Amino acid sequence: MTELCPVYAPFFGAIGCASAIIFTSLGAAYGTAKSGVGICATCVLRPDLLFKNIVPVIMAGIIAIYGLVVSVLVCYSLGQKQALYTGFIQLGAGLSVGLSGLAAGFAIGIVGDAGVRGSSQQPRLFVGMILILIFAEVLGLYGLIVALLLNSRATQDVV
Amino acid sequence: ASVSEGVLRKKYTKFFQENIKTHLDLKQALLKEEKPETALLAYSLVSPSGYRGEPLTERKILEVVSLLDEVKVDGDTYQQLKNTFDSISKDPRMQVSLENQYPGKGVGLLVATGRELHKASVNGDAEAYHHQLEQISQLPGRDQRLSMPMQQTLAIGHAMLSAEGAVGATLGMATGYGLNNEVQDQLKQGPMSGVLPRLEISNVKGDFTFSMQEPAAVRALMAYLGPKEDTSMSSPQAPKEAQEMEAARLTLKQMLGSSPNEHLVPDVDSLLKLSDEDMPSQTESTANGAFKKLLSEDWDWLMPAVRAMDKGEAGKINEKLTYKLPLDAANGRVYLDKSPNLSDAQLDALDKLGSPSQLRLMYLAEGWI
Amino acid sequence: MEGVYFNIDNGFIEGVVRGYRNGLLSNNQYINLTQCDTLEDLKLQLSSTDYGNFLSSVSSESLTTSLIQEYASSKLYHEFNYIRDQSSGSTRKFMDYITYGYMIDNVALMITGTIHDRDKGEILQRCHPLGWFDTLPTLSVATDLESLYETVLVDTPLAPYFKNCFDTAEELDDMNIEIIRNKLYKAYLEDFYNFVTEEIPEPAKECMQTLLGFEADRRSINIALNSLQSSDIDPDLKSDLLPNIGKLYPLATFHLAQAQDFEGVRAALANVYEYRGFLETGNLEDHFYQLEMELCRDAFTQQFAISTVWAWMKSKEQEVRNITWIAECIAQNQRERINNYISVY
Structure with a gap:
């Protein structure tokens, strides 16, 4: 328990793995x-x-895999004597x-229920639904990119 | 107007009032009236094996089934049923029908729960298939005497198997008798099913007697009435004992509504399929697929399609089963229409079949096609 | 409690409508009106009440039974418009919801009168001046519904109530317009019950819930007793005309939707305690008017509540029905059933 590695330092990483x-x-x-x-x-x-209308549920199910692959990588960098900088990251x-x-x-x-209710009256709206859902899907991928760029710097030059 | 029933147990209340708990002198207390040509006939349901090795000599069901057979209004139809049944219990083809439907006479929690819920759902769909099959024989031209109690037995057995599967899944999930008895007596209320004769069997093994209010004997009876008659067994060139059993088999098969040249073999097996001689005629398999598409998409599209098909109107099915339902979309309610999208190659095949035989529709509801 | 925040914007309204209540004719004043010989005697005897000097500037010989209820109703409607101009926030919405139920009747009357080829000016009279909505006389064109809703009804406040109404696409007869009217009134009563539940405070909340439940029950019984007549309606097509609120909804509206004869309606109301004394009687509407007046009298005991604005408005409309019934017997010398007015106050 130094000044740059206290004992309450795994608190931040532990509630960052859960969050x-x-x-x-x-x-x-x-x-x-x-x-x-x-x-x-x-x-x-x-x-x-x-089976045509199942595709927004598959798109919502991909978001939880993003959080799963962030939580299993934070968990392998946890330690008892880590720094506060690692916990902040x-x-x-x-x-x-x-x-x-x-x-x-x-x-x-919100896009997917209106899309599956509207695509069954006009079959030429199913490609517009997928086009809007791809734009809604990449908003989680940006946070995945940020979470993978932060975790790469958690134990680079850390004493 | 083929059959009518009643469920009030206070009209003939003399034979059920006191403790008449013996088949001995049960026919002696059965006269009790001006019943002479209508008293010994009702005893004939329990006369062969109702004393000769009988448990308890009565029960609550076995005596109530005898006085719900009021036959005072007319005694011709049930007399022909008593002559037709038990004249059919002589051939070995009926004997092997009563052997295939009878005996000799962690993650594993997820797997067991999956088995029980599959049992619940599969035995629950068939009850609905039989409930929309007892309003098909309500239509004019059908019968209500042999069809109605035969498919009110199968729905009760499917309801019991569905409740058994759900109780098993609940008892297995909440851990890893009084509930099955509570659903058994509950289905014993409501309407009253008409009687069918008893089908006693006396072969070299012994004197057996089945019930026809149990689903195993019902399920074994319609497999017997399946196949068409062959070049033998009906000609007047081997007239040994065939004009009393094959005539009875054909009059039952026609009383269902089946033609004498319809095959209808059961298909549930793990073996190889129906080879070529028991395989359908390519305008029947298409029609069977049309019936299975009608069952799988709505709970009320079999009876109006059969009603239209009996009138020869089996090309007008697509525009008489269509109906409109609302859809609250993002631009207001729109009232779309659900319709059975039959293709033309299966809309003319329903013209090949004139009227659906009730025996085909009962293999359809049991799952044998 | 309720009196703490009520009088910030509704105390003047409360006092004025309680003073309006105090001018309701009691039982002795109807006896004095019954003893009148001619119609001028009825005018003098009504001059000593809170109607006083309203048939001034008419004549002594232009006094007619129609004119008396025209002026006695116009007084009521000017009083309602005076109370509604002094309201704001939630009370203004409450009184607009009172107005919509008369707007629906004006809509049905105008659409029915357009079909029978009669004058637009004679349908624009006898057309209840409280539910007006300025674009109303434009309903005398284009005799199908899809050219009515897509041109003039989307701007009205009745526009959310046309959701369950588009199952026909043809012209209209007397049956279809009554089906449209019953469906609009169903959607109206359900929306106004939902407004009362989420937004009105408690002693007025429960009073308006039991009053709107009574209105829904009377609509249900009259639709059930007007559908066993010379018509043929599918029973699931009749359950779309019965409102989803009231004290006979979740069981008795299932049985009223399937009643095939008059004994199927007596069997359905036999289970509900407040009813089944109604179908062996003289008149059937004289039970509903009597029970509505006993409900409206009970609503005047709650002191900090805007249900009073309802309870006045239905009581005074009963009063204009009573005077007309006396004036139809004095002008026609039919004193045999003259004491069949309905008086609770």
Whole structure:
């Protein structure tokens, strides 16, 4: 327990590991629940567009894998005698992917239910739905890029 | 107007009032009236094996089934049923039908729960298939005497298997009798099913007797009525004992509604498929796929399609089953229409079949096609 | 409690409407009106009440039974418009929701009168001046519904209530317009119940919930008793005309949607305690008017509540029905059933 490596330093990395998988699961949960209401209300009428309409739920399920691959990399850099700088970096890497995935999941849910309700009246709207959902999907990938760029600097030149 | 039933147990309340708990002198207390040509006939359901090695000599069901057979209004249809059944219990083709449907006479928690929920869902769909099959025989031209109790037995067995699967999955998930008895007596209420004769069997093994209110005997009876008659067994050139059993088999198969040249072999096996002689005629498999597409997409598209198909209107099916439902989209409610998208190659095949035989629709609801 | 924040913007309104309540005719004043010989005697006897000097500047010989209820209604409607001009916030929304139910009746009356080829000016009279909405006389064109909603009804406040109404695409007869009216009134009663539940405070909340429940129950019973007549309606097509609120909803509206004869309606109301004394009677609407007046009298005991604005408005409209019934018997010498007015105050 030095001044640059205290004992409360794994607190920040431990709640940065938890905050990555928590806030991507809430985003994926809203993006699955909001979208799955509009799928179950639309495949009553059109039962053969069911596998076509499943694609916003798959897009929401990718967001939780981003938080999973951030949480398993922060966890392998945790230690008892680590620095505070490492704990700050692991907080930043958790919160970036967590809140970016939360916002991306809100967007994917709200776009996806309206898209599957509108694509079953006009079949030429299903490609526009995928085009909007790709723009909503990359908002979590930016937080994944930031979380992977922070974690690369957690133990570079750290004493 | 083929059959009618009642469920009030207070009209003939003399034979069920006191403790009449013995088949001995049960026919002696059965006269009790001006019943002479209508008293010994009702006893004939329990006369062969109702005393000769009988447990308890009665029960609550076995005596209530005898006085719900009021036959005072007319006694011709059930007399022909008593002559037709038990004249069919002589051939070995009925004997092997009562052997295939009878015996000799961690992650594993997820796997077991998956087995139980599969049992629940599969035995729950077939109950609905049979509930929309007892309103097909409500239509004019059908029968309600042999069809109605035969497919009110199978729905009860499927409801029991569905409840058994759900109780098993719940008892397995919450850990890793009184609940199955609570669903058993509950399905014993409501309407009252008509009687069918008893089908006693006396072969070299012994004197067996099945019930026809149990689903195994019902499920073993319709497999017997499946195949068409061959070049033998109906000609007047081997007239040994065939004009009393094959005539009875054909009058039951026609009483269902099946033609004498329809094959209808069961297909549930792990073996190789129906080879070529029991394989359908390529305008039947297309029609069977059309019926399976009608069952799989709505809970009310089989009875109006059969009603239209009996009128010869089987090309107008796409525009008589269409109906509109609302969809609250992002631009207001739109009222789209659900319709059965039958292709033309399966819309003319339903013109090849004139009327659906009830025996085909009961293999459809049980899963044998 | 409720009196702490009520009088910040509704105390003047409360006092004025309680003073309006105090001018309701009691039982002795209807007896004095019943004893009148001619119609000028009715004018003198009404001059000693809070109507006083409202049939001034008419005549002694231009006095007619129609003119008496025209002026006695115009007084009521000017009083309602005076109260609504002094309101703001939530009370203004409450009174606009009172107005929408008369707007629906004006819509149905105008659409029905357009079909029978009659004058637009005679449908614009006898057309209840409280639910007006300036673009109303434009409904005398283009006799199908899709050319009505897409031109003039989207701007009205009745526009959210046309959701369950687009299952036809043809012209309109007397049956289709009544189906449209029943569907609009269903959506209106459900939306106004939902406004009362989320936004009105408590002693007025429960009063307006039981008053709107009574209105929904009466609509349900009259739709059930006007559908067993010479028509043929699918029972799931009739459950779309019965409102989803009230004390006979979750069980008895299932049975009223399937009643095939008059004994199917008596069997459905036999389970509800406040009813089933109604279908063996003289008149059937004289039970509903009596029970509505006993409900409106009970709403005047709650002191810090805007349900009073409802309870006055339905009581005074009963009063204008009573005077007309006396004036139809004095002008026609039909004193045999003259004491069949409905008086609770």
